[PDB]
Coordinates of C-alpha atoms and ligand atoms in Angstrom, one line a residue:
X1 CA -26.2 44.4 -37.5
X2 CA -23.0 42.3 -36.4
X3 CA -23.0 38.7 -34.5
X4 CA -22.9 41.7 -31.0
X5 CA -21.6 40.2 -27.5
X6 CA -23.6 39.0 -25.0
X7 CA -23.3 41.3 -22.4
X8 CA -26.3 40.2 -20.5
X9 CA -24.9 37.4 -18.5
X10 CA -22.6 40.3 -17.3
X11 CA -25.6 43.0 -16.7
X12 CA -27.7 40.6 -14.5
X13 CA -25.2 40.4 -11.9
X14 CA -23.9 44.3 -12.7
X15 CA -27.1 46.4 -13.1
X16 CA -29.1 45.0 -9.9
X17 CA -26.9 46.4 -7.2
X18 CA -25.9 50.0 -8.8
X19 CA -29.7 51.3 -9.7
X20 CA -31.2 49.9 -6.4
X21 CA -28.1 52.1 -4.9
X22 CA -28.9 55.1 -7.2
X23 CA -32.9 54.1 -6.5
X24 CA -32.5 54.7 -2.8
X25 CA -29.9 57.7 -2.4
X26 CA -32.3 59.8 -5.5
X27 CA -35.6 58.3 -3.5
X28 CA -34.1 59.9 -0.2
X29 CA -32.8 62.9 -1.6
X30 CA -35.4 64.5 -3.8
X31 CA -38.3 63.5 -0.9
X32 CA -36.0 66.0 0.6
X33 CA -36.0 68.4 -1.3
X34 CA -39.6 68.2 -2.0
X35 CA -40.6 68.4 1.9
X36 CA -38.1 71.3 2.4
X37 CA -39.5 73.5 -0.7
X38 CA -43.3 72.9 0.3
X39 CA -43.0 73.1 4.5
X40 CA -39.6 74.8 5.2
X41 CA -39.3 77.4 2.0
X42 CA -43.6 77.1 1.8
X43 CA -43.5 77.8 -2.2
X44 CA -43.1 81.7 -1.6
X45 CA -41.0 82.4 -5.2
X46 CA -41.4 81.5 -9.0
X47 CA -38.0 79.5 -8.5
X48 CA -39.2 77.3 -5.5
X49 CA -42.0 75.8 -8.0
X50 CA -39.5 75.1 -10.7
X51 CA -37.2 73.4 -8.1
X52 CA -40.3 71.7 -7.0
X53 CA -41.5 70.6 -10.2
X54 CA -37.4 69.4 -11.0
X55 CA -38.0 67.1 -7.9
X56 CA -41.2 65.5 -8.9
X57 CA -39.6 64.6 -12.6
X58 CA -36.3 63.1 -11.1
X59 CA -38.8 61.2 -9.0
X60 CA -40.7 60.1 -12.1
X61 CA -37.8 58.9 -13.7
X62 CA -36.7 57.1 -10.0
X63 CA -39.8 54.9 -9.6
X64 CA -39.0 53.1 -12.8
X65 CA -35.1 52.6 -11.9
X66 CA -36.4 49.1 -9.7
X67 CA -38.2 47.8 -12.2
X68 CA -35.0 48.0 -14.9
X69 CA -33.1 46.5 -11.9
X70 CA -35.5 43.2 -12.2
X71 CA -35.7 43.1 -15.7
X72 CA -31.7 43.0 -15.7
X73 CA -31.2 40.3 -13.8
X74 CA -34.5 38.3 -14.5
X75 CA -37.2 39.2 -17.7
X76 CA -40.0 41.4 -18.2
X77 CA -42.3 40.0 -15.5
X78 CA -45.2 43.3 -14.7
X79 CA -46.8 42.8 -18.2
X80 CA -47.6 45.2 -21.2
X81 CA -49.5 48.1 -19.7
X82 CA -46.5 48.7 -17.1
X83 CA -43.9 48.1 -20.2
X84 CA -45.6 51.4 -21.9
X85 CA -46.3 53.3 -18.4
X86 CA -42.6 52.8 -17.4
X87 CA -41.1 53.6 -21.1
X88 CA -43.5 56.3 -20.6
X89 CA -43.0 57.9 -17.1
X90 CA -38.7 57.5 -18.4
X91 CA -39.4 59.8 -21.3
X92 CA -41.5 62.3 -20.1
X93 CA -39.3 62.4 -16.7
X94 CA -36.2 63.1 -18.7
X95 CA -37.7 65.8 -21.0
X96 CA -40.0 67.8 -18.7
X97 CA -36.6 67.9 -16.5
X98 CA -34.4 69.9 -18.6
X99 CA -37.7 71.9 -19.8
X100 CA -37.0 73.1 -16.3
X101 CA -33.7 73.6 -15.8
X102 CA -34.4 75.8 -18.9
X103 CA -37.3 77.8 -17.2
X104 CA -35.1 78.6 -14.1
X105 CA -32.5 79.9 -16.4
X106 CA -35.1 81.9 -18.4
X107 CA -36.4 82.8 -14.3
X108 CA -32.7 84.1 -13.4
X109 CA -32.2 85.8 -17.0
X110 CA -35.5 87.9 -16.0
X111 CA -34.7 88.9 -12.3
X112 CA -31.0 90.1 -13.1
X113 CA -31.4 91.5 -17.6
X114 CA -35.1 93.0 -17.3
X115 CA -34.8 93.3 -13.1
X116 CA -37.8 96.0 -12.7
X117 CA -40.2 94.2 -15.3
X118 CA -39.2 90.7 -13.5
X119 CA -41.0 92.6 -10.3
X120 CA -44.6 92.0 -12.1
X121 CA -44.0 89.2 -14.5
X122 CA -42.2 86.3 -12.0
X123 CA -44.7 85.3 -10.1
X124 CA -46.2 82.4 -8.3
X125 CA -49.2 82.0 -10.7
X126 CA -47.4 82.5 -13.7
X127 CA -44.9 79.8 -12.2
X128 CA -47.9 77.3 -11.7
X129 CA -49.4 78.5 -14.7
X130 CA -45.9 77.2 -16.6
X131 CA -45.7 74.3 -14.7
X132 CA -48.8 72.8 -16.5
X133 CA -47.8 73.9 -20.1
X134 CA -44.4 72.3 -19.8
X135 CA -46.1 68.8 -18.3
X136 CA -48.3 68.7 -20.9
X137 CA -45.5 69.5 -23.7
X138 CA -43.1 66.4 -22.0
X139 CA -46.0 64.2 -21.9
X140 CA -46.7 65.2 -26.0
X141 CA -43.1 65.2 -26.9
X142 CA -43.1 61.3 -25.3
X143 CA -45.9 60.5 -27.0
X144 CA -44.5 58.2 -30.4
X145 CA -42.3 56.7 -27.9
X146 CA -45.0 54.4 -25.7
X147 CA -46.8 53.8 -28.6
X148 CA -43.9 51.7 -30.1
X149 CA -43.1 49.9 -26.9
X150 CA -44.5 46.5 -26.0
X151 CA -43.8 43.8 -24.0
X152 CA -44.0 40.5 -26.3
X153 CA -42.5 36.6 -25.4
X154 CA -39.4 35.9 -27.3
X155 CA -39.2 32.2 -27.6
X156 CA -39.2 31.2 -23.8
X157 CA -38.3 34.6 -22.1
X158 CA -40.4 37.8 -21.8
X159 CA -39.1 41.7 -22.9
X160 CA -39.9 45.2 -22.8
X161 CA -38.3 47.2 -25.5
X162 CA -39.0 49.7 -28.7
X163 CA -40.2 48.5 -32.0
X164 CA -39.9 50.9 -35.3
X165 CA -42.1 49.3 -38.1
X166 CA -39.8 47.8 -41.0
X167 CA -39.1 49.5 -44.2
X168 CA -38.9 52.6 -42.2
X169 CA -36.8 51.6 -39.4
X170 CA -33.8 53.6 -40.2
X171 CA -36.8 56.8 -40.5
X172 CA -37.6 56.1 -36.8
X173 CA -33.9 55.5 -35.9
X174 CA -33.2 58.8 -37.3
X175 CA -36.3 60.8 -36.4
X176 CA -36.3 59.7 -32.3
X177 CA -32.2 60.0 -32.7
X178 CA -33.1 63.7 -33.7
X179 CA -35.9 64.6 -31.6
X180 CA -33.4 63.3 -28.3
X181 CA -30.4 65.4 -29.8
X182 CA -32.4 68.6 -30.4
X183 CA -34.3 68.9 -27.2
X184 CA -31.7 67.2 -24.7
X185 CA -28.4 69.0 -26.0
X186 CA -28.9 71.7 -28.9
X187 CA -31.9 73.2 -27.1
X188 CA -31.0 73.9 -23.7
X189 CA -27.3 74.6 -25.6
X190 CA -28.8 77.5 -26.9
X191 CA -30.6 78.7 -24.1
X192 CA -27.0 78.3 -22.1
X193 CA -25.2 80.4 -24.5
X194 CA -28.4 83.4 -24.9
X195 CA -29.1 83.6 -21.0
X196 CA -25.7 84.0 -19.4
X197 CA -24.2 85.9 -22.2
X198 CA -27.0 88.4 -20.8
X199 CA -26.7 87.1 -17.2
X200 CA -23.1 87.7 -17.3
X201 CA -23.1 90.9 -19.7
X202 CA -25.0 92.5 -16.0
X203 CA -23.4 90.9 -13.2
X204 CA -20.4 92.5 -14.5
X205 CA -21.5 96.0 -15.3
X206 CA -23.1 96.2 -11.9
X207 CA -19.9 94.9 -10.1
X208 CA -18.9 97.5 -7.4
X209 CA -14.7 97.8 -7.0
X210 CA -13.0 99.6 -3.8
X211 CA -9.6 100.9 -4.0
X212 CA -7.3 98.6 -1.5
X213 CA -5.5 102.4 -0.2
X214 CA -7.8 104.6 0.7
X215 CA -10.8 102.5 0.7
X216 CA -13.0 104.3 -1.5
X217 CA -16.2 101.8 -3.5
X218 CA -16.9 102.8 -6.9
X219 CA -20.2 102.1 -7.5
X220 CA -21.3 101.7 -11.6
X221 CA -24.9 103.2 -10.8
X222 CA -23.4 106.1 -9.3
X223 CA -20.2 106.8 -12.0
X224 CA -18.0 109.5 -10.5
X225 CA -19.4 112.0 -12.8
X226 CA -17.0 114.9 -11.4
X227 CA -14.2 113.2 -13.2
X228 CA -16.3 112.6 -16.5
X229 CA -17.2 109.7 -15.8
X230 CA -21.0 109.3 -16.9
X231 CA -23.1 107.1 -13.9
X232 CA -24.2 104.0 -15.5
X233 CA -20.3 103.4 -16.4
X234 CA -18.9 99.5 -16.2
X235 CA -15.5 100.2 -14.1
X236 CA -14.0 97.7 -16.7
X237 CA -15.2 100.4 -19.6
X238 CA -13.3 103.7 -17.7
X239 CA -10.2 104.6 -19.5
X240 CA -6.8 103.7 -17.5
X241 CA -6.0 107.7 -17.1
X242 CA -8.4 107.6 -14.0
X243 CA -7.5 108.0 -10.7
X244 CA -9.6 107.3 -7.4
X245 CA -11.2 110.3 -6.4
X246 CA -10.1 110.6 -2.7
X247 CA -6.3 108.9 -2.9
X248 CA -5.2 109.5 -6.6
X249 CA -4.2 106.1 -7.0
X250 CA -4.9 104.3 -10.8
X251 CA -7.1 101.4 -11.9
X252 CA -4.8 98.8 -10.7
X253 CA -4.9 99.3 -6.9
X254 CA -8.7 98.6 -7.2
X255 CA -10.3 95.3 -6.5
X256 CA -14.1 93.7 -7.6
X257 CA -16.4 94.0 -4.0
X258 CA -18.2 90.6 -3.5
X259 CA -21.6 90.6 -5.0
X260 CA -24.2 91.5 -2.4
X261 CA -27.7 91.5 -4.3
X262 CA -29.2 87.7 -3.7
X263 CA -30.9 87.7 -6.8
X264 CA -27.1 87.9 -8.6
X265 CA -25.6 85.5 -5.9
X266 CA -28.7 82.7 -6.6
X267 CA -27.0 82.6 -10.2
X268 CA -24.2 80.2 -9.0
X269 CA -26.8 77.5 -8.5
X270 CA -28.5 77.3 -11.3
X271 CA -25.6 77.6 -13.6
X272 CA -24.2 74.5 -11.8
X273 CA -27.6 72.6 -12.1
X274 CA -27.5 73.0 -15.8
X275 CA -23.3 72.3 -16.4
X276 CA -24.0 69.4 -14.2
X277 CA -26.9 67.8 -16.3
X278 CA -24.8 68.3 -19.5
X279 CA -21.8 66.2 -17.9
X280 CA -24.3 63.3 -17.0
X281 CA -26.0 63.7 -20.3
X282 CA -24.0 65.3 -23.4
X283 CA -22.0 61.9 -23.4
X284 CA -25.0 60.0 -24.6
X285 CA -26.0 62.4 -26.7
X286 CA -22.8 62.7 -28.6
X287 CA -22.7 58.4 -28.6
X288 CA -26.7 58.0 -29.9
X289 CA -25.4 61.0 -32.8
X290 CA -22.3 58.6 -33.6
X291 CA -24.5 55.7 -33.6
X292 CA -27.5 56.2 -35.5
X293 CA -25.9 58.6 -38.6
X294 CA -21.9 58.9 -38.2
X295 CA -22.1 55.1 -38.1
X296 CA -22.3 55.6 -41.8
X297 CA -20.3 59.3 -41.8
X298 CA -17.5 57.2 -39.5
X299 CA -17.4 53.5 -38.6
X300 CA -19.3 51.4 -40.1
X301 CA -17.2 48.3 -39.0
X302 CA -18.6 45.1 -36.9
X303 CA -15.7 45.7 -33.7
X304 CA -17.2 49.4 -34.0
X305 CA -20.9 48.1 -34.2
X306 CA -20.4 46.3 -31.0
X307 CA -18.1 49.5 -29.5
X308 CA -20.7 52.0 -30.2
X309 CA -23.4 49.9 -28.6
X310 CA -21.9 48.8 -25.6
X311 CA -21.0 52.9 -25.4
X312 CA -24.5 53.5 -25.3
X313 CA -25.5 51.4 -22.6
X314 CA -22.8 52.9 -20.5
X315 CA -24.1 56.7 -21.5
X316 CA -27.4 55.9 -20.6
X317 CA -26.9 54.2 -17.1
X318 CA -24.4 57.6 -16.6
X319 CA -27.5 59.3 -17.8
X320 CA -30.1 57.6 -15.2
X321 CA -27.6 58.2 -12.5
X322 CA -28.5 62.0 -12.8
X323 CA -31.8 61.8 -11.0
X324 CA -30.1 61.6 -7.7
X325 CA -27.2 63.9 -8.4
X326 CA -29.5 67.8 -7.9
X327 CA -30.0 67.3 -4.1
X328 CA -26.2 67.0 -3.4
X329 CA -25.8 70.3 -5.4
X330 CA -28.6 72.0 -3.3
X331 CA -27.0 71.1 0.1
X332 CA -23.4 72.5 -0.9
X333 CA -23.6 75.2 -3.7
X334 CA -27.3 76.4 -2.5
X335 CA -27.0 79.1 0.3
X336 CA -30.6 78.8 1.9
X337 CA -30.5 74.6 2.0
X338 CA -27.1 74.7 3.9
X339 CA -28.3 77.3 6.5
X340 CA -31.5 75.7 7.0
X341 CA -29.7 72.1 8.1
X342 CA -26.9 74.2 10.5
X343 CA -29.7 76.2 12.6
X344 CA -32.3 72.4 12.5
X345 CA -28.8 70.4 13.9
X346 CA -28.2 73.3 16.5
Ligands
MRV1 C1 -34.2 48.3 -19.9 C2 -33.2 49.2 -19.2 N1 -32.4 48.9 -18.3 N2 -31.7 49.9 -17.9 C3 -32.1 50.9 -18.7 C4 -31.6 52.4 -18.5 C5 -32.2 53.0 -17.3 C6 -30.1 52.4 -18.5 N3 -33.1 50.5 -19.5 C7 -33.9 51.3 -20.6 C8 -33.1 51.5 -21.9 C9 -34.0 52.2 -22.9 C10 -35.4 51.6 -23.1 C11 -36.3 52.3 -22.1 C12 -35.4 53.3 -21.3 C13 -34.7 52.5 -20.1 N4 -34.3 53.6 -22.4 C14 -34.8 54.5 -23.4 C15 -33.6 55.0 -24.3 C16 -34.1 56.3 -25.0 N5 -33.4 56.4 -26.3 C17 -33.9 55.9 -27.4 O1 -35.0 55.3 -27.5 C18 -33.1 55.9 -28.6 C19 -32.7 54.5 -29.0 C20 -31.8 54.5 -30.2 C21 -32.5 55.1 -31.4 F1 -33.7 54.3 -31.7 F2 -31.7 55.0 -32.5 C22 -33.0 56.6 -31.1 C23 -33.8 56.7 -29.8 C24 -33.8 57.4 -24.2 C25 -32.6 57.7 -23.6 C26 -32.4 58.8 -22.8 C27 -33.5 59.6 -22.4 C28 -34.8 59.2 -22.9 C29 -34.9 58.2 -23.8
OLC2 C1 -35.9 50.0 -0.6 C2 -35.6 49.9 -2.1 C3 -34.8 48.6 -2.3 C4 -34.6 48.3 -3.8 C5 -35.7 47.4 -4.4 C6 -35.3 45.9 -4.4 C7 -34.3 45.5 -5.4 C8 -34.9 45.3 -6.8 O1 -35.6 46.1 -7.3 O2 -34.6 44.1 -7.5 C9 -35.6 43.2 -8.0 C10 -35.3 41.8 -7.5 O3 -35.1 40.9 -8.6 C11 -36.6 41.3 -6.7 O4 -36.3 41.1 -5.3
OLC3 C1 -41.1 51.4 -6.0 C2 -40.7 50.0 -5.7 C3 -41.0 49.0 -6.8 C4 -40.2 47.7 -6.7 C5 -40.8 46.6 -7.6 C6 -39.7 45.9 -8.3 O1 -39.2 46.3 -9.3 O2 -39.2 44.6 -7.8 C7 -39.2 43.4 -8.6 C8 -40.4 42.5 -8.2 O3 -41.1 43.0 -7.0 C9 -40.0 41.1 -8.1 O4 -40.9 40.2 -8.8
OLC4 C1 -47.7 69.6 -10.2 C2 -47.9 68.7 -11.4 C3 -47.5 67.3 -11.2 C4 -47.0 66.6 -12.4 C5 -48.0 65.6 -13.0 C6 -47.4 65.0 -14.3 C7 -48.4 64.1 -15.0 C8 -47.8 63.2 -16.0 C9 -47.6 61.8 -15.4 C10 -48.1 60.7 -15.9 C11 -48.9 60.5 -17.2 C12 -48.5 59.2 -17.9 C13 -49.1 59.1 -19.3 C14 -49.2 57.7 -19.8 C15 -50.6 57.2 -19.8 C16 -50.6 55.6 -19.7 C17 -51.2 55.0 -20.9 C18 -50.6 53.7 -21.2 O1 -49.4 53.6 -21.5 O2 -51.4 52.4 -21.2 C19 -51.8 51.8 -22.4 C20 -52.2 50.4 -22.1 O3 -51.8 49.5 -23.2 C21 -53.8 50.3 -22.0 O4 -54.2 49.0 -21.8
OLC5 C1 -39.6 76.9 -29.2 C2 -40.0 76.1 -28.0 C3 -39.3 74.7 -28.0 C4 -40.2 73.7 -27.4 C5 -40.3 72.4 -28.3 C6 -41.1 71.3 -27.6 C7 -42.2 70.8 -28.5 C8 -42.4 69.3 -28.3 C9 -42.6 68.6 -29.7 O1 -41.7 68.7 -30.5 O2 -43.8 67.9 -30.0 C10 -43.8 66.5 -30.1 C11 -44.7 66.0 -31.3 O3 -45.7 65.1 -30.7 C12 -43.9 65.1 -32.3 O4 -44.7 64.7 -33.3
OLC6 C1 -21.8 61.5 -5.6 C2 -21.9 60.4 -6.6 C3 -23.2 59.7 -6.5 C4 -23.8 58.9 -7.5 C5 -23.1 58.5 -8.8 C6 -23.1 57.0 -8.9 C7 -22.8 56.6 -10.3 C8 -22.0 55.2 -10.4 C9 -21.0 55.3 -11.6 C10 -21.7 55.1 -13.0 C11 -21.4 53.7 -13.5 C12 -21.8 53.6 -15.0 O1 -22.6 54.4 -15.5 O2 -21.3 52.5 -15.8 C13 -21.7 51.1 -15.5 C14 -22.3 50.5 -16.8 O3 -23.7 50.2 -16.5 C15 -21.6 49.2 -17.2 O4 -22.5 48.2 -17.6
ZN7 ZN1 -8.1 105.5 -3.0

């Protein structure tokens, strides 16, 4: 490419300070989440080993954080073996966690779209069983990855970084470009858009609504079948010429009851989990798309060589940042983790 900046000078003094920060906040917080899960919630649901199994891959990708820290601000000083173990436990940290953010919203999908069948299929077994499957595919998926890394002496100074054979680099640029975009963003995209429009499709045709005169609770299960209105009816779906069966009053003076069923209410949680992730990571993956291909479909330019790069260092290290970002979410959007911490203080 272009004569690029050097940057380095600038990331030495930069990079140290921020990922031993993000090192010892994410250390703290998913060793509590792990110890709460295992001896407060004891590993009683499906759910509580996917959240377990979350921890344990943000932890993965922690333990490498301090030794990116060193190698900022110093070289590539813990040999070759580490260089690929490192490269390695980044890769398969990063994919085996979204593999399951997307099994808890595949768990949640079952317990609230296919509730009675969700009684016999989400179990802990089945959870454990799933757990090693999805390892074993992160591991697999990380795979070409290691084997291109080394570490190798540069003239005087030692590094750690990727190397795509020649003659085919632009192949490798593209492929490992492709293989990031599909299972980072398009994949759990598509699980997204599947779940909740399913997810959502049921929380609201089971939403109860109670008349603000009278107080009367139409209840969807129930209908109000004396009226012609079949049970099994969405309130949203009745047709505005209904009137509440005790006052008379129309549609309008009803109001949606606040949703009572825990398995509906556990919903908010994982839906922020996964918006959260995309907001740390769709940045870089929109940046590394621009970079490898619309670098020829866009700018192809030396100032936006140099732009695009220095765009993807700052995506990634927003990226990394993510591995100490779940616990926070836990302690204020997850019900049972706040409760817990108000009776342990008192
Ligand atoms: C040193 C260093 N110092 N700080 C850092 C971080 C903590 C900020 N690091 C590194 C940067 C590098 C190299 C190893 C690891 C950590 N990072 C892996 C980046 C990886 N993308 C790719 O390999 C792209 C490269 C471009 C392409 F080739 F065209 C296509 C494939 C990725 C990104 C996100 C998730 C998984 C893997
Ligand atoms: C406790 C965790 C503290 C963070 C680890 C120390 C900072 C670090 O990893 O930096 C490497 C440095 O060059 C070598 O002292
Ligand atoms: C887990 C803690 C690992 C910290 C090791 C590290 O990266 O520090 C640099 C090195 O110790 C300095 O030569
Ligand atoms: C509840 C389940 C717990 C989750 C458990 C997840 C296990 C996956 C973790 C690490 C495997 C790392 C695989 C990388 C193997 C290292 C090989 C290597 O890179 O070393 C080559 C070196 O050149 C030779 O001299
Ligand atoms: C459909 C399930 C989607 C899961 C896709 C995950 C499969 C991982 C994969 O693509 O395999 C890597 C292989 O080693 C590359 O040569
Ligand atoms: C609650 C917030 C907790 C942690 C987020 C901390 C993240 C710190 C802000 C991200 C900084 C960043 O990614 O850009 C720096 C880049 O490395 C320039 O070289
Ligand atoms: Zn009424």
């Amino acid at each position: 490419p272009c004569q690029k900046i050097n940057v380095k000078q600038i990331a030495a003094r930069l990079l140290p300070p921020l990922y031993s920060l993000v090192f010892i906040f994410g250390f703290v917080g998913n060793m509590l989440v792990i110890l709460i899960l295992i001896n407060y919630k004891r590993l009683k649901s499906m759910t509580d080993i996917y959240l377990l199994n979350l921890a344990i891959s943000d932890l993965f990708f922690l333990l490498t954080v301090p030794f990116w820290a060193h190698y900022a601000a110093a070289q590539w000083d813990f040999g070759n073996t580490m260089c690929q173990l490192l490269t390695g436990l980044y890769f398969i940290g990063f994919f085996s966690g979204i593999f399951f953010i997307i099994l808890l919203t595949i768990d949640r999908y079952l317990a609230v779209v296919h509730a009675v069948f969700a009684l016999k299929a989400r179990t802990v077994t089945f959870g454990v069983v799933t757990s090693v499957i999805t390892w074993v595919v992160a591991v697999f998926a990380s795979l070409p990855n290691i084997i291109f890394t080394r570490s190798q002496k540069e003239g005087l100074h030692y590094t750690c970084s990727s190397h795509f054979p020649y003659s085919q680099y632009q192949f490798w640029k593209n492929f490992q470009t492709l293989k990031i975009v599909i299972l980072g963003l398009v994949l759990p995209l598509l699980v997204m858009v599947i779940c909740y429009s399913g997810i959502l499709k049921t929380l609201l045709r089971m939403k109860k609504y109670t008349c603000t005169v009278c107080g009367y609770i139409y209840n969807p299960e129930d209908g109000d079948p004396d009226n012609g209105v079949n049970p099994g009816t969405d309130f949203k779906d009745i047709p505005d010429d209904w009137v509440c069966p005790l006052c008379g009053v129309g549609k309008d003076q009803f109001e949606e009851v606040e949703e009572e069923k825990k398995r509906h209410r556990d919903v908010r949680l994982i839906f922020t989990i996964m918006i959260v992730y995309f907001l740390f990571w769709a940045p870089y993956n929109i940046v590394l798309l621009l970079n490898t291909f619309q670098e020829f479909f866009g700018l192809n330019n030396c100032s936006s060589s140099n732009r695009l790069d220095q765009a993807m260092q700052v995506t990634e290290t927003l990226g990394m940042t993510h591995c100490c970002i779940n616990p926070i979410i836990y302690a204020f959007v997850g019900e049972e983790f706040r409760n817990y911490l108000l009776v342990f203080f008192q």
